[PDB]
């Protein structure tokens, strides 16, 4: 029978060839493929499809799903397509067509909807992987609900709480502090991984930290980012398969950017805040982004470049670093050039990741909105990418989503567990209403359970009455949080029973394959170039051409959605 196109879309969501506007941005996602059989689509409700002996099987199966997300529009580096998502044992069991092979055609064999299956209607919703914030200052436990409320499910970084060292650096230093924080982590729903102090010219002190559970090391100028410290840190990182993060020598005390690059010696390193406002070699830190071994991220305050970016920074730097009011400027000439270039470099696929720098010159619940604000800004400025095939922004979308999902996962050695919507991976997923995509998520699923969601009045006759606000769900509570949350550690710690030894009840998993990740390993952001900075004008050059962007007067996913 013939169903009117509007009626089909209302009932099941968009199909092949349909374009979805991402929030209030000018970005259009086109459905590349639909894995359904028209007429066999799953719908939950009274008199609907998912019923005993109909859409729900009465035949037992080894692949009976624990949860079915019906008619989802997946947005991932893997593609922008329409499919049913099947969760089983807190993992993405299958992606395709779910249902009952007894009564339906074209059912994916390992996607059985049965007696033990729970239903979640994804028709008309966007499903993405949970975001990974690889630049977290563990300053306040209140960052976690803010992060979840913005689609972030994993947090890498360091800290001890609101002490001066954490206020500046993403470092949990030494054995005792690492043990204390890993045990504190038990409380939360958020996946965590801690970085130790990398700023050492002695092996023993670095090794102690990896063995204490650190997923890597942070090198920060506040503890001295000298060439000696750069070499020693990477040497231990190479031995123990852990990642290194770097905030370079801003005041060029022990050497210039090239001297730091030389100390690295082509070894894998995660260069935090590549633009340079958050810190790093003045004015040429951005020149590192061109190098193949350099895995570059950007922190939220500089992305997207707006008419208030520079003004906000010429004071935000003074509160964070605690500088004299006698200091006025240098940053007023240096900063516009690199901040402008940063946006363009993101669009070019030169900067591979977006991160927060949470309460340490950056916002916790802003990674996701700011990534899409930049995508939107550049599409408005530089047009639809030449790379696009059709009347859609799919390639740019895939380039931008990779920045906070897959690329941080690859960098930190957790790409086998999380980072993307793929079969076999842990079910850390976010459900979005297209009108609120990138700004306000609906449901946060972690380890196959709902952990956080937008929820109305607790007394109310339905879950919709006002006030609708973000609340912790069952997956975030009791002993279920130990089933849905991961504390990442080094292989050495993992293999030596850190879980048992620290009495951690949470899922403990090792980080692996950190040392041989280059720019070539990323998804949609593999671009290498000869990046140069004029030391007089502070202008950024990509292979001799000028690299710049215009500051935004207004951004998408902001004013329409927030009260304050």
């Amino acid at each position: 029978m013939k169903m009117k196109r509007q009626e089909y879309v209302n009932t099941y969501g968009p199909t092949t060839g349909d374009k979805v506007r991402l929030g209030d941005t000018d970005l259009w996602a086109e459905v590349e493929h639909d894995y359904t059989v028209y007429g066999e689509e799953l719908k939950f409700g009274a008199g609907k499809t998912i019923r005993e002996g109909m859409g729900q099987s009465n035949s037992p199966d080894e692949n009976t799903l624990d949860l079915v997300i019906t008619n989802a529009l997946i947005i991932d580096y893997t593609g922008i397509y329409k499919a049913d998502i099947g969760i089983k044992n807190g993992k993405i069991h299958g992606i395709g067509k779910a249902g009952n092979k007894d009564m339906q055609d074209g059912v994916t064999p390992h996607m059985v909807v049965g007696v033990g299956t729970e239903a979640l209607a994804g028709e008309g919703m966007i499903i993405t992987a949970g975001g990974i914030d690889s630049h977290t200052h563990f300053l306040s436990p209140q960052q976690f609900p803010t992060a979840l409320a913005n689609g972030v499910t994993t947090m890498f970084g360091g800290g001890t709480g609101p002490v001066d060292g954490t206020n500046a650096t993403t470092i949990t230093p030494g054995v005792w502090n690492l043990h204390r924080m890993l045990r504190a982590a038990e409380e939360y729903g958020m996946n965590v991984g801690l970085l130790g102090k990398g700023n050492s010219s002695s092996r023993a002190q670095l090794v102690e930290q990896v063995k204490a559970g650190a997923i890597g090391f942070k090198l920060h100028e506040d503890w001295g980012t000298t060439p000696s410290a750069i070499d020693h840190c990477l040497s231990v990182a190479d031995e123990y398969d852990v990642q290194v993060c770097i905030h370079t020598d801003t005041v060029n005390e022990a050497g210039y950017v090239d001297d730091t690059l030389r100390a690295m010696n082509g070894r894998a390193i995660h260069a935090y805040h590549i633009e340079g406002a958050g810190g790093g070699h003045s004015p040429d830190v951005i020149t590192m982004a061109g190098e193949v071994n350099i895995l570059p991220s950007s922190t939220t305050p500089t992305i997207p470049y707006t008419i208030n970016t520079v003004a906000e920074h010429l004071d935000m730097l003074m509160t964070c670093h605690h500088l004299d009011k006698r200091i006025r400027f240098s940053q007023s000439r240096i900063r516009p050039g690199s901040i402008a270039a940063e946006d363009t470099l993101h669009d070019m696929g030169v900067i591979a990741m977006t991160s927060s720098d949470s309460q340490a010159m950056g916002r916790a619940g802003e990674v996701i909105p700011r990534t899409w604000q930049t995508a939107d800004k550049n599409k408005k400025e530089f047009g639809r990418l030449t790379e696009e095939k059709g009347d859609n922004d799919n390639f740019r979308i895939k380039r931008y989503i990779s920045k906070y999902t897959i690329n941080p996962a690859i960098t930190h050695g957790v790409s086998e567990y999380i980072g993307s919507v793929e079969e076999g991976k842990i079910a850390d997923l976010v459900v979005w209403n297209p009108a609120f995509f990138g700004v306000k998520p609906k449901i946060i699923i972690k380890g196959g359970m709902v952990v956080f969601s937008e929820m109305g009045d607790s007394n109310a006759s339905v879950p919709t009455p006002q006030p609708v606000y973000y609340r912790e769900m069952f997956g975030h509570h009791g002993k279920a949080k130990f089933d849905t949350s991961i504390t990442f550690v080094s292989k050495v710690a993992y293999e030596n029973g850190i879980k048992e030894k620290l009495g951690l009840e949470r899922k403990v998993l090792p980080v692996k394959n950190c040392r041989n990740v280059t720019k070539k390993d990323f998804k949609f952001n593999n671009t290498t170039a000869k990046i140069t900075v004029n030391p007089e004008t502070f202008e950024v050059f990509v292979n001799g051409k000028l690299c710049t962007s215009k500051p935004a007067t207004e951004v998408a996913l902001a004013s329409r959605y927030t009260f304050f």
Partner: protein, 225 residues
Amino acid sequence: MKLTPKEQEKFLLYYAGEVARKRKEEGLKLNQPEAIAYISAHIMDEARRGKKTVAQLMEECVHFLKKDEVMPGVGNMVPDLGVEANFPDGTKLVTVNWPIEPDDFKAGEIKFASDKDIELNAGKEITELKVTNKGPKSLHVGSHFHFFEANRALEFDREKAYGKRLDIPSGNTLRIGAGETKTVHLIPIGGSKKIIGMNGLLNGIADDLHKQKALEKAKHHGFIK
């Protein structure tokens, strides 16, 4: 007798040869195993007589069986045959290339999609370089060896070979004879260009940043004169 397990194997091979001989005498066209055993038994016989050399037999056994003496496709199926036999000077391997004459039939025949050449290493920038083997002995360099790290006997502008490999089929080698001069075609190494090992002149990414250090190591180790 003290029969070794290898002697027990040879009896079966020899008996198979004898059965094959009987079938040929009956006027039957021999199949794949019959043809192999027929030739093997001849080699085993001549070796026992100890009057022929391995060199003689290798030559004598080419097309030992003719196309019409075997079933179709038998010759193509057996492009080479090997048989170890005891000679007066000990056990020696008799290697025959084309023991059975081939015909128009080919089992497992591959039919090409096109006769057009395959463009290997497509889109890679070719670097022409003059190389001279100033050494007393000839040498070869493989397809994926970092050209810059080749035997110090080779004389060329090493700077121009930094982070490059030979634009030759994968697995092939280029020969440069003692005293010989050749024009080589070099292409940039694939992937990340993370060159670890060989002569240890680089041991890292072949970028501009590592280049001066690499050229200094090459000079110090005698690769650059």
